[PDB]
């Protein structure tokens, strides 16, 4: 199984930063 977690964020800039990092980790992780 996999688990999807929800992280709630205030402030567009905060959200945009975290989205870029999430996207990067999706692509850099071995799986």
């Amino acid at each position: 199984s996999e688990e999807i977690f929800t992280l709630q964020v205030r402030g567009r800039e905060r959200y945009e930063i975290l989205k870029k990092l999430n996207d990067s980790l999706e692509l850099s992780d071995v799986v």
Copy 2:
């Protein structure tokens, strides 16, 4: 109104890294 953005994250370890970063970013008034 205040917009709360949702960041969907696969996996506990990935979530915990991003949550730590969010913990910091939410304390920062100017990002």
Copy 3:
């Protein structure tokens, strides 16, 4: 004891800016 400060090297201005925002936030918040 003492404190260690590490030089993080980042390629590219836009990548530098995102990591700078994070580091600046961490310096204030001290969450790590």
Copy 4:
């Protein structure tokens, strides 16, 4: 591109930012 520096206080803080930087070097998202 140029390489820029950021001074990072403390090993654990350096390690989290290094993890992100290394990820970005692999993914090229930013």
